[PDB]
From a paper:
We also determined structures for PG9 iGL in complex with ApexGT3 and for mature PG9 in complex with a Q130N variant, ApexGT3.2MUT, that contained a glycosylation site at position 130. The additional glycans at positions N130 and N185H, present on ApexGT3.2MUT in the PG9 complex but not on ApexGT3 in the PG9 iGL complex, do not make direct contacts with the PG9 Fab. The beta-sheet main-chain interactions with the gp120 C strand are in good agreement with the previously reported crystal structure of PG9 bound to a V1/V2 protein scaffold (McLellan et al., 2011). The GT mutation R169 forms h bonds with the HCDR3 on two different gp120 protomers and is also positioned well for co-planar cation-π interactions with Y100e on both PG9 and PG9 iGL. The sulfated tyrosine at position 100e on PG9 iGL interacts with R169 on gp120A, while the mature PG9, which includes a sulfated Y100g, can also engage the N167gp120A glycan. Similar to the PCT64 complexes, the number of interactions with the glycan at N160gp120A increases with maturation, with PG9 gaining four h-bonds with distal mannose residues. In addition to the interactions with the N160gp120A glycan, PG9 also acquires additional h-bonds with the N156g120A glycan, one of which arises from the W(100k)Y mutation in the HCDR3. The angle of approach and HCDR3 conformation were quite similar for precursor and bnAb in the PG9 complexes but differed in the PCT64 complexes, which implied that bnAb structural maturation may be simpler for PG9 than for PCT64.
Residue numbers in the entry:
A (entry chain H): 3 to 52, 52A, 53 to 82, 82A, 82B, 82C, 83 to 100, 100A, ...
B (entry chain D), E (entry chain B), H (entry chain F): 520 to 546, 567 to 663
C (entry chain L): 1 to 11, 13 to 27, 27A, 27B, 27C, 28 to 95, 95A, 96 to 106, ...
D (entry chain C), F (entry chain A), G (entry chain E): 32 to 58, 64 to 141, 150 to 185, 185g, 185h, 186 to 309, 312 to 321, 321A, ...
The structure:
């Protein structure tokens, strides 16, 4: 259950901060993605964050301006977006990354602090929130 | 009477059962084999310590020891008739328990040295 | 990081078998078996149709299949239905560890 | 005054002593206490009355109790050591309901657990399931599907238990003194704990004592010959428990009224595991039937005795225990290998003043049990086939006083105490052990 | 003769080897150490039990003791010359086996109660 | 002129008695039985002849053998207890029968098996293979797979073996009585173990006995000096075994004529395992040779002795055993650590009547062997590098007299009776154990 | 007129003898030596007041050394046995560099390494990390990633450790003789094995000896009181070691100046493992200090004594050892349970001739440790949190001479001693044990 | 003097206090439990062997013996004035150790074995 919040209408050069409330899953052991889709356009990957915050990956197209972060206690995913461009107008989505334990040699395999590995696909999408610049 | 049958009798009366009491002094890596050995061995050690004391005193083979050593008058406020006829062994032991070591030491030194010194003096 | 190329649109009659292609590179489609396809109902976030080149999630019918050869991947839709209409997308993982989507394909059922 | 010392050997003198007494027995092959090695018993012990002897000895300070304690615990492990470990079963259990006609008392008591079992080959696992009692199962994760559970102790010391072959019958064991030692016995039935006993005799061996483990009531023990006796170290010290010996047994009929089956799996190389299978017939809760009239008389007598050391115009309330873990809130006992945890509140819900029809006490059944004295070891009780009807005698009680009251009145007593040493206090009150001291000083007239 | 070499000897003849016979009565990953201890302990217990019996009969240190205990003809159908010169100890023991316990009791009781009385009388 | 009963001591009196004996070693690498925990023997425990003594004793009522049995077993376990277990190897095996120019008698006897195995690290799963004898494996499921096999004891007690440096040589051990005890030995030559012996001597220690394990033939023992002696508890009871002590040694030459190569792996933390890899040369059946003429003469003497015991001018015949597994139908023995299961039916394919030529016995080799008289254990016999050839003598035979009221003729004798305790009967039939009772009672004239 | 044979009993005569001594404790509950079976003894010495008997005895003849040695090893196994095996950790270990302000001479000493691990459930594996010392980690495959390692002893006997409560405090143990035996203490403060001891006082119990085990410099032992004494089994034998007992203590201050974190995980069912965590502050080499004066001038006393075994105008050199295993190459001691290895490069370098400034030695830390004399077992040394500092007393040296010298000069000595027993030889040098033989015979005249 | 107080002294002087020497002859799954049982057994068997031997020699209960067995010249190169007055027991025992068995055997055969026979013959 992913619920985006913080969308609104801003002027060019402004900053906006999104958050995604979440429930139904051990947020703290699973990775997350931000995806955006401009009206009339296809899906654009924005960023990925590992469950423990150890690795972050951002699209070249959003570098500098967008930054992915998370709060394990809040069970919340965030997107900090600065110096906003009109090109950044899009519906932004909170997406849970599919994952679980690798099965090898009749055993399951966890990542550090019993983390879930990335099955490599999206599973749960929120409704999305519109960000207009 | 059997073992301790005379336990409440006077000390004099009970002397007739000393043999009876003597008869009752003598008779796997998990918790039973070792315990039995410990019990058996200790029973033997207790037995032998008393036998050694009797031996050093010149009481080997005797039911009753007899020596030439007097006891201390400070150890008694009683005459022999009271001691033998109006008291039992449990009572008596309590009455004189603090003099046990003293008398054993006196009996051993006094008679062991006198008897062996006489044996050499009277050897021929 | 560029988009994966998809046909702008595909179409066919009900019951028709159609294919939606996706053209990537050696750093993604020809790099791992980590490819996947999504179906986006207009106005909604998309659902997984395919993952790992050809695997279906529970709830997806066997009319949805696919394959991967070299740097080119595709989604096969057999028995095409009007209910299938939507925007189809390919996705892949990269050496940079970034996620990339294709341009998307519009599906029309005749 | 011109007198000399003689020494008599074979003198009838006693000294308090602490030594080991040995296991004596009449003689199936494997019992926990009636073990392979135990020494045949004297068929004719010689009890010798002692004329003119008064001897004082203790209860509760009596080390014979301590000796049984250490040996019963150590032996429990030695006899039950070579059992199949249940470590291989510590996997997640997928839990659902029981497909039967389940009564209202039994709702929630049983679970049907499904898991991937280890087989005797290292290359194989199989789908298996078993039934468990609720008391032994814990939820693995509210965050994940609330259908996954674990055995209660897989995150602590491993549970080990098989040995279906071992007898748990509480066969009484006699204890015998080594040569050089003697056992004194008190025949004064009116003694109240520690003090001089005017009526004594001696023995070579004690009578046999049945190793019955209990947390509240004393079953199949020594019965008082005349009247109910209440004994304690200090009647005003509520930190101490109360021993009540009855002069009449109370018959109690306990059951686990379900026809059970047993299933098993080979886990490893002869590493067999047995578990609860399905149930034949419907599902009903365990219970015990205590005669109401007998019980009423039983506690009435207890009150008459309480009033000897406590006064009148006091209402004596009997109440259920105040709380604690299962072992101290229920009456725990073993019936043929089955472990019962019975609710005795029905026995302690009344008052007495100074001026058939049974009690169908509900019971629970538990299988993963920690040793009474520690949690570093635990066992999984094997399942038992069929239906059990357990019949025993209540020969006593261990009670706790609700100490502290306004104007020293309207006292309340509750059942309890899980300390195993308290279950031998009655049987051992009659005995003391002494060393024989054959030499004595004999002042006289010879040279 | 060697140890137990007197087994076929007559009771009288065998009386000449008694010192030998008496001398020879006396001597960690395995459980064998326990059985070895048991064997040694038991040998001691058997030895001591017999020694105490001899001692209580007034035989401490004596291979042979003369006592004061008479006995019934019901316990023998033989004269002393047959008993000592023709018979062996093995056969003899069998022939009078059922009187063993009786005699041991008599030897102790009929000698010690009387010796005790003599010691008291001999005080004056 | 009256008599008094006096005290004697040092008296030469014996009583039948039971106790244990001490292990005495004669003239390092530890041998399974000739253990480090065994005190060196008396180089000359000189026996003494007893003048004018006849004594009776009865073999089979003799507990010296029972003591030997328990000790040979306990030592077997003390030695094997710290060895590497084969449990990690209880995996499915993919088995075929690739051999290098195998003869016809051997077809199907050897199997070429591949399997998954571990190494010292838990993540390094590797492929391994070895050769097995057919007798050691079973198809887990033929229907699922033609080649899927498993080891015969993986579904029961774990198979264990390592300790390659242990010697299984039956090194003789002498046994000594404790102080207070002595052993009477029979020096007669025509004597059977039950009844009076007119010629005896006393000893403290027995001769050394080789702890030979065998099932049909009594090998490497003490030969009769004059005549064949046949011993039985009840000579006409066909439910009992017959001991035949020969006065003629018979030599037997056994071999495994295959130059097997031994390979080894590590399974876990120093957990070494040894197995046959390839085999040098072609494949031939194991076998034992005896002289035909010697065996024929041996039986002729046995036949005469049997007639002495039964009817005159009668017919005696021989046959092999009436089925059962190898442990009871073949002659089972060990040499070099390997076990042999030889077909002895050719030694019994003869009849007798009232009025260079050799025998070859084919043999089987087995490596997974259960315990002597137990089913709670399994052992793996490691291979011996190279070719093994062993020579030993037959000292005696174990016979079974078949039943049927066949008019006291055409009696059939068979091999069988492979109970280890019956083997040792052939050595201790000459000994009696007694307690020494130095205390004597007798009348005389004194006071 | 002639003489007669007389037996005297209670004669004060000694016989050389061997038996064992009892463990006698004096004033966390249990340690290898603080054994639970050990009997508190009487602190009062049992002297014979220098009774004037001369007796010759020596070292390297003294079997008590062997007993101390064997008892200690047995005790180690007893405390080491009931602990967690570390076998579950023998997995592929993934290593990279620790990057925390490492000082240059510490580069390569520490490894940051990841691995998979077992957990509470048997069908689950998790990722875990720890910090390791380089010495115990070995690379497994140049052909594969240069990051793959294993623990040094996973291919041999399992490494085990737990029981963190238990310490290794070398608590002194006193040893007592059984009745019938006596211990002879040499009161000569200036003796050697080259002759008899003129002053001996026997005791029933010895003083306590601390089981401190060291490889080169003996710590916390008995110091000589009057002079420096050098002892050897054979003073001219290059194959023997040299024991130097100093009469001057040398203080040594050791440290591991690195602030550690101890972390722990569950390996299995109540099976805990402790390991090195985050080190905070700079990474620095462990080291030990002595002052120059107390080492350099102290050795001159050693030299004066060496010159008594060697000739006059002889040049003496000290040097470093030839190497070999770390166990013999470096100084080694344990403190806090941690095992320290130190290179005595600053101690053995200078040459002695006929005619505030400190010394610091570098040290290293090791955790996977075999026993000095055996590799059939291995133990793991647990981490210590925070910073550890230790101060010890050097009481003696174990030196090794080179293989002779040219024309009795430039005699070179190196640190040495490869025999664990040297640690007790150095303490028991003052004692001998005899048996009491109370019977004897002498001529006299009597009856 | 205490235990071994005169061990290095004159044999005669050292015979004055033999009582201490006698007293010092007499007094958990780990190897210490095993050693304690073994040691206790050892002490007991040794003690008993000496007592048994004293019994054979007719020295029960004595510290000082007397016999009918004469001293052999091969056993000594000294007078009593040298043996008892000018040397220790340790040295003495070292010098005559070769005769331990012959002496003991002679005492056994010539002392109690012969006296006991003579006593039986003096019965009437
Ligand atoms: C009936 O009784 C006879 C004796 O009367 C037995 O005869 C011999 O018994 C031995 C022991 O069982 C046979 O085996 C020998 O074992 C030795 C073991 O020593 C070490 O070295 C081996 C090396 O492979 C290690 O495996 C082992 O652990 C030890 O460390 C071998 O060394 C012997 O081989 C060498 O010596 C023999 C001569 O003795 C030479 O011929 C060999 O070429 C080689 O140099 C040997 O293997 C021995 O084979 C028996 N001899 C015969 C003729 O049989 C009978 O075994 C016994 N039979 C039965 C059934 O009980
Ligand atoms: C009974 O109680 C009284 C009072 O406390 C006490 O003095 C007496 O010794 C007790 N007697 C027995 C046998 O317990
Ligand atoms: C209580 O009543 C009984 C009679 O039933 C009497 O003997 C006893 O003394 C009374 N006790 C008190 C404290 O009044």
């Amino acid at each position: 259950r992913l619920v985006e919040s913080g969308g609104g209408v801003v002027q060019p050069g402004s900053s906006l901060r999104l958050s995604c409330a979440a429930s139904g899953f051990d947020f703290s052991r699973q990775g997350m993605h931000w995806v955006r889709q401009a009206p009339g356009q296809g899906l654009e990957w924005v960023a990925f964050i590992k469950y423990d915050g150890s690795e972050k990956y951002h699209a070249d197209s959003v570098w500098g301006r967008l930054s992915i972060s998370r709060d394990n206690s809040k069970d919340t995913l965030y997107l900090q977006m600065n110096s906003l461009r009109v090109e950044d107008t899009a519906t932004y989505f909170c997406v849970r990354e599919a994952g679980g334990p690798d099965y090898r040699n009749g055993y399951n395999y966890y990542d550090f602090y019993d983390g879930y590995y990335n099955y490599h696909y999206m599973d749960v999408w929120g409704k999305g929130t519109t960000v207009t610049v | 009477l059997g073992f301790l049958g005379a336990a409440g009798s006077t000390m004099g009366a009970a002397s007739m059962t000393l043999t009876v009491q003597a008869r009752n002094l003598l008779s796997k890596d998990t918790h039973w084999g070792i315990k039995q050995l410990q019990a058996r061995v200790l029973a033997v050690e207790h037995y032998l310590r008393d036998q050694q004391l009797l031996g050093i005193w010149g009481c080997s083979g005797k039911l009753i020891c007899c020596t030439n050593v007097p006891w201390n008058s400070s150890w008694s406020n009683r005459n022999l008739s009271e001691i033998w006829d109006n008291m039992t062994w449990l009572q008596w032991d309590k009455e004189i328990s603090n003099y046990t070591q003293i008398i054993y030491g006196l009996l051993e030194e006094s008679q062991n040295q006198q008897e062996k010194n006489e044996q050499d003096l009277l050897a021929l | 990081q560029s988009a994966l190329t998809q046909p702008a649109s595909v179409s066919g009659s009900p019951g028709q078998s159609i294919t939606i292609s996706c053209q990537g590179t050696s750093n993604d489609v020809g790099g791992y078996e980590s490819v996947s396809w999504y179906q986006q109902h207009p106005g909604k976030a998309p659902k997984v149709v395919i993952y790992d080149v050809s695997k279906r999630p529970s709830g997806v019918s066997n009319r949805f299949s696919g394959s991967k050869s070299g740097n080119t991947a595709s989604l096969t839709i057999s028995g095409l239905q009007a209910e299938d209409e939507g925007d189809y997308y390919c996705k892949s993982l990269t050496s940079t560890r970034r996620r990339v989507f294709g341009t998307g394909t519009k599906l029309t059922v005749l | 005054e011109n007198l000399w010392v003689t020494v008599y050997y074979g003198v009838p003198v006693w000294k308090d002593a602490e030594t080991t007494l040995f296991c004596a027995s009449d003689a199936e092959k494997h019992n926990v206490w009636a073990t392979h090695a135990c020494v045949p018993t004297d068929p004719n012990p010689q009890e010798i009355h002692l004329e003119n002897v008064t001897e004082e000895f203790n209860m509760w300070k009596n080390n014979m109790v301590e000796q049984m304690h250490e040996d019963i615990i150590s032996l429990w492990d030695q006899s039950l050591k070579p059992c199949v470990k249940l470590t291989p079963l510590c996997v997640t259990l997928n839990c659902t309901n029981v497909t039967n006609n389940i009564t209202d008392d039994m709702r929630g008591e049983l679970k049907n657990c499904s898991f991937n079992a280890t087989t005797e080959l290292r290359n194989k696992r199989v789908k298996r399931y078993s039934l468990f009692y609720r008391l032994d199962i814990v939820q693995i994760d509210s965050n994940r599907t609330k259908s996954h559970y674990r055995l209660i102790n897989c995150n602590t010391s491993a549970i080990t238990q098989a040995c279906p072959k071992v007898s748990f019958e509480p066969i009484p064991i006699h204890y015998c003194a080594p040569a050089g030692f003697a056992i004194l016995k008190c025949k004064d039935k009116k003694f109240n704990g520690t003090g001089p006993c005017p009526s004594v005799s001696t023995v070579q061996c004690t009578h046999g004592i049945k190793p019955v483990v209990s947390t509240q009531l004393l079953l199949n023990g020594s019965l008082a010959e005349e009247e109910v006796i209440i004994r304690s170290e200090n009647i005003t010290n509520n930190a101490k428990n109360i021993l009540v010996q009855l002069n009449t047994p109370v018959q109690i009929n306990c059951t686990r009224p379900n026809n059970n089956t047993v299933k098993s799996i080979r886990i490893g190389p002869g590493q067999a595991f047995y578990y609860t299978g399905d149930i034949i017939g419907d599902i009903r809760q365990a219970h015990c039937n205590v005669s109401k009239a007998t019980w009423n008389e039983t506690l009435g007598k207890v009150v008459k005795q309480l009033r000897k050391h406590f006064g009148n115009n006091t209402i004596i309330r009997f109440a259920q225990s105040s709380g604690g873990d299962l072992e101290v809130t229920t009456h725990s006992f073993n019936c043929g290998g089955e472990f019962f945890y019975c609710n005795t509140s029905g026995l302690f819900n009344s008052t007495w003043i100074s001026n058939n029809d049974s009690i169908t006490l509900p019971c629970r059944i538990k299988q993963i049990i920690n040793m009474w004295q520690r949690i570093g070891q635990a066992m999984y009780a094997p399942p038992i086939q069929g239906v059990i009807r357990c019949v025993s005698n209540i020969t006593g009680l261990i009670l706790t006083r609700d100490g502290g009251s306004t104007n020293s009145t309207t006292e309340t007593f509750r059942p309890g105490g899980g300390d195993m040493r308290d279950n031998w206090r009655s049987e051992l009150y009659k005995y003391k052990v002494v060393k024989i001291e054959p030499l004595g000083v004999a002042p006289t007239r010879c040279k």
